Amino acid sequence: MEKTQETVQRILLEPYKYLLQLPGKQVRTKLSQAFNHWLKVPEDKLQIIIEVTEMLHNASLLIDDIEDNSKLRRGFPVAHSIYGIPSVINSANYVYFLGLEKVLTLDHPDAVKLFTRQLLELHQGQGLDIYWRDNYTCPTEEEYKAMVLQKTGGLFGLAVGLMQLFSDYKEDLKPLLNTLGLFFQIRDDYANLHSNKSFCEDLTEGKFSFPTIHAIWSRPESTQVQNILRQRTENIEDVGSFEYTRNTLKELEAKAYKQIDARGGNPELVALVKHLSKMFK
Amino acid sequence: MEKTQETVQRILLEPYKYLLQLPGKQVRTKLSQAFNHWLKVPEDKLQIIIEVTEMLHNASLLIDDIEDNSKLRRGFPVAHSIYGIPSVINSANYVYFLGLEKVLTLDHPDAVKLFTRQLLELHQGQGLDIYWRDNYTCPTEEEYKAMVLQKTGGLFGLAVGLMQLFSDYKEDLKPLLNTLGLFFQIRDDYANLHSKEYSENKSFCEDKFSFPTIHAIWSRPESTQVQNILRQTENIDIKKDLVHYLEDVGSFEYTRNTLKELEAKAYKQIDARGGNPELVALVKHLSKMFK
Ligand SMILES: C=C(C)CCOP(=O)(O)OP(=O)(O)O
Ligand SMILES: [Cl-]
């Protein structure tokens, strides 16, 4: 049972390990560690939380790449181009439940409730993202943000919320988490599209991210075009798109620094935000 | 957030609601009812468990159809032809977590543990099935059986396990569950190759190994007639060929014998648990297929 449980687990995890070994930032690791400046979670619990968070993050990327027909991830072919969609779905989903299993080792009665809630949020966000893309209905800036706070902030919320289960630190971290979730997402959007080639391809495909959203709604005919496209569904700043994105990022950065200062400072979190902000300067 | 949650929910669940309308046997409900002879679960808990089980099962079917590249289910388009693979993955996975959420309403400390274990088993079984197919690894009979017990019985095991959490009856039903899991799957394998009526109702217009072909491959290890037949004819012809080869090597007889042993074992194990007329009658009816 040891030798072949281990073979099975290794087989099932192959697509996931492919992605995990690619060069990446582990921002969720770094964020959680920086947040522990406030929360003072014991190392053993923190390690579990970080593992859960990174597991779910990587698994969700496998799924994301299938859901939007991406070709590359972290510079390399997406897992499903190598292993097939079937094995990748299975692998990513297996990791979700291995994440659940690991949450149970936290031995806290609220942990599973929080994990369930955050996974449901994540799927709501993802599901909207997909729906818009499939119907070519470009979200507004505000719709995009709300979706991102579910799809991206869902996991940030899980890490910090699980930490809060093991901490007497009671300050409201939700505003800062919202800022950070938007910041990270929009920064990714910017990093992916700033060098026309990916940008134009996105527009062709109906792949919506912060720069293309700005570009689409910038044209006056946008409203009437988008309204025709939204009738098919259950759907309700004169500057360049990259400049607008850079400006949004600078605002989000400044806001983060304000919110960190409002919580008494956090040099490690500040240094992380500053490093990540080089991307758009 | 009130009127809006409902819209989003409906978007997310559309592929799942489509699949709910498709023909199906609802055996998991029938087996749960049969196990309730012993377990006598309070109706409020039983209703939740059955809903959880059916949700997880239907979600797994959405995923299964993507994972094995099915084109039809019971003669109708697979969900992902209608809604696309991205929406279906998202829908099925959302339902998994809605299932988790509902398991929490059972308010028993062991329910989530059971859920986790059984979902992990399900994924291991599915994952092996996929791996073998993708990597041209023909399993042995013993490996196939072990895979089937995970893939086919993972959710069966969850239903009964969750039931037993709210039952005074605490005897070990796992051996019987294993026998039943194998029996159901191998009977399906058999019926799908040996019975035109059963094939027509279930796998209408469908072209992936199974108990009989595994026996045929490993019993005549030098032959490659199975592989060669599958690589060839429109499916009626391919199937005839496969069927004749299986006939000629004794794979149908071997499968019938395996099923008879599984049947007899089930009756012995049911008797050892104190008897269960409903389950016995169901096994007997299902056993006609191979008599
Ligand atoms: C939801 C989002 C924004 C995914 C991208 O995250 P990362 O930029 O952290 O990707 P890796 O470093 O983990 O590759
Ligand atoms: Cl510190």
Numbering used by the authors:
A (entry chain A): 1 to 195, 201 to 241, 252 to 296
B (entry chain B): 1 to 207, 212 to 236, 238 to 296
List sentences from the manuscript.
In this study, we engineer double-site mutants of human GGPPS to eliminate the Cys247–Cys205 disulfide bond observed in the Y246D mutant. This represents the highest resolution structure of human GGPPS to date and provides the first glimpse of the enzyme’s interactions with its substrate, isopentenyl pyrophosphate (IPP). Direct interactions include salt bridges between Arg74 and the β-phosphate, Arg28 and the α-phosphate, and Lys 25 with both α- and β-phosphates. In the DL mutant, where Cys247 was replaced by Leu, these disulfide bonds were eliminated. Second, the disulfide bonds disrupt the conformation of the α1–α3 insertion region, which acts as both an inter-dimer interface and as a partial lid for the enzyme’s active site.
Geranylgeranyl pyrophosphate synthase (GGPPS) catalyzes the production of geranylgeranyl pyrophosphate (GGPP), an isoprenoid intermediate required for protein geranylgeranylation. GGPPS synthesizes GGPP by condensing the allylic substrate farnesyl pyrophosphate (FPP) with the homoallylic substrate IPP, releasing inorganic pyrophosphate as a by-product. Unlike its homologues that form homodimers, dimers of human GGPPS further associate into a homohexamer, creating an overall structure with a “three-blade propeller” configuration.
